Amino acid sequence: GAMDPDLEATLRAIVHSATSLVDARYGAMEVHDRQHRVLHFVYEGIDEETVRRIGHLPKGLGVIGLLIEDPKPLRLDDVSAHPASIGFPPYHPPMRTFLGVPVRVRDESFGTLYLTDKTNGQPFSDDDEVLVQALAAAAGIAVANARL
Amino acid sequence: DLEATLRAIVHSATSLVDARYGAMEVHDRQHRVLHFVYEGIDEETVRRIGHLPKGLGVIGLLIEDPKPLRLDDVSAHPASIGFPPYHPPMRTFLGVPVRVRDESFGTLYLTDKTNGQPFSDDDEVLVQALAAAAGIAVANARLY
Numbered sequence: 245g246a247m248d249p250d251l252e253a254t255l256r257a258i259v260h261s262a263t264s265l266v267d268a269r270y271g272a273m274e275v276h277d278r279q280h281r282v283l284h285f286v287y288e289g290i291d292e293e294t295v296r297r298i299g300h301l302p303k304g305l306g307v308i309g310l311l312i313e314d315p316k317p318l319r320l321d322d323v324s325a326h327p328a329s330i331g332f333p334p335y336h337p338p339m340r341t342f343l344g345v346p347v348r349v350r351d352e353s354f355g356t357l358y359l360t361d362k363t364n365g366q367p368f369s370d371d372d373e374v375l376v377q378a379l380a381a382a383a384g385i386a387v388a389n390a391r392l
Numbered sequence: 393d394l395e396a397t398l399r400a401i402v403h404s405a406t407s408l409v410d411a412r413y414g415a416m417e418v419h420d421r422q423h424r425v426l427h428f429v430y431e432g433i434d435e436e437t438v439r440r441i442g443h444l445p446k447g448l449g450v451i452g453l454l455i456e457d458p459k460p461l462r463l464d465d466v467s468a469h470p471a472s473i474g475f476p477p478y479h480p481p482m483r484t485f486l487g488v489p490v491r492v493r494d495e496s497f498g499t500l501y502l503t504d505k506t507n508g509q510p511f512s513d514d515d516e517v518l519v520q521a522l523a524a525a526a527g528i529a530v531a532n533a534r535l536y
C-alpha cells in the first residue's frame with residue numbers, strides 16, 4: 245500500500261530541503277517497519293530513466309545498515325571503500341561523499357535519511373551534520389504520528 | 393508531550409535559520425489559542441508583556457489565509473497590529489502554516505535573523521518542511 249498522503253508530502257519536503265540546504269547531488273530516505281524492514285523509499289536527484297535501469301529498490305543494506313546498527317551520524321568521504329559497503333548495483337550512479345543519520349523518536353527507529361555527493365567535491369560539514377540530524381528528528385515525529 | 397514536540401520543532405526552526413526569536417501558535421476552529429510555544433525571550437520580559445497573543449495582525453493574516461509570509465519589516469505590512477508594551481522590538485519576519493491537506497491548525501513563525509539579514513527562499517522552504525511535521529503531530533493529537 246501507498247503512504248498516507250500527508251506523510252508522503254512531508255517526507256518528500258524533508259528530503260528536498262536536506263538535499264538542497266546541504267548542497268547534496270542526491271538525497272534519500274527509507275521508512276521502516278518493525279525489525280528495521282524497508283517499507284518505502286523516497287529519493288531525489290536521479291532521473292526517471294536511470295531509476296528504470298537500476299530496476300530494483302534498496303533493501304537498506306551495507307553502509308545504510310550502520311545507521312540502524314549504530315544510531316549516530318555517519319560521514320564518509322568514500323562510501324564504497326567502507327568494509328561494510330555492499331557496493332552499488334548495475335546502472336546506479338557512482339557516489340563518494342556520504343552523510344547519513346537514523347530517523348528516530350527517543351529510542352524508536354523509523355528509518356534512515358542520507359545524502360551523497362556534495363556539489364563542492366568536498367566532504368559534508370559539521371553544520372551539514374547538525375541540520376540533517378534535525379530534519380531526521382522532524383521526519384521521526386512525522387512517521388510516529390502518521391502511524392499512531 | 394505534544395507541546396514538547398512543538399517546542400522541539402520551534403527550536404529546530406529558530407536554530408537552523410539562526411533567528412533570534414521563534415514561536416508557534418495552535419488555534420481551534422473558532423481561532424482561540426490552544427498552544428503558544430516560543431523561543432528567544434527571557435521569563436522576565438514575558439511577565440512584563442503579560443497577556444498572550446490572540447493571533448492578530450500579521451499572524452491573523454496567516455490564519456485567515458494560510459501561505460508562507462516573509463517580510464523585511466513586520467511593522468510596515470498593512471495588516472500589522474503592532475507590538476504590545478514591553479514586547480521586544482522585532483523587524484524581519486518569516487511565517488508559515490502548520491497544516492495537513494484537510495485542515496490548517498496554526499502558524500510557525502520566526503523573527504530577526506541574526507546580523508540583520510532578510511529571510512531567504514531557503515529558510516522558507518526549510519521552515520515549511522518542519523511545519524509539515526508539526527501539522528501531522530497536531531492532526532494526530534486532534535484524533536485522540
Ligand code: HEM
Pocket residue numbers: 270271272287288289290295296298299300301302303304305306307308323324328329330331332333336339342358359360
Ligand atoms: C537518489 C538518491 C540515492 C542515494 C543517496 C543512494 C545511496 C546509496 C548508497 C550510498 C548505496 C551504497 C551503500 C553501500 O555501499 O553500502 C546504495 C546502494 C543501493 N542503491 Fe541507492 N541511492 C539513491 C538512489 C537509488 C535509487 C533511485 C535506486 C533504485 C531505483 C537505488 C537502488 C540501490 C540498490 C538496490 C543498492 C544496493 C544496496 C541495497 O539494496 O540496500 N538507489 N544507495
Ligand code: HEM
Pocket residue numbers: 413414415430431432433438441442443444445446447448449450451466467471472473474475476479482485501502503
Ligand atoms: C519569542 C517569540 C515571539 C515572536 C517570534 C513574536 C512575534 C510577534 C509578531 C510577529 C507579532 C505581530 C506584530 C504585528 O502584527 O505588527 C506579535 C504580536 C504580539 N505578541 Fe509576540 N512574539 C513572540 C513572543 C511573545 C510572547 C512571549 C508574548 C506574551 C507572553 C507575546 C505577545 C504578543 C501580543 C499580545 C501581540 C499582539 C497581537 C496579538 O495579540 O496577536 N509575544 N508578536
Ligand SMILES: [Ca+2]
Pocket residue numbers: 264265266267
Ligand atoms: Ca548552498
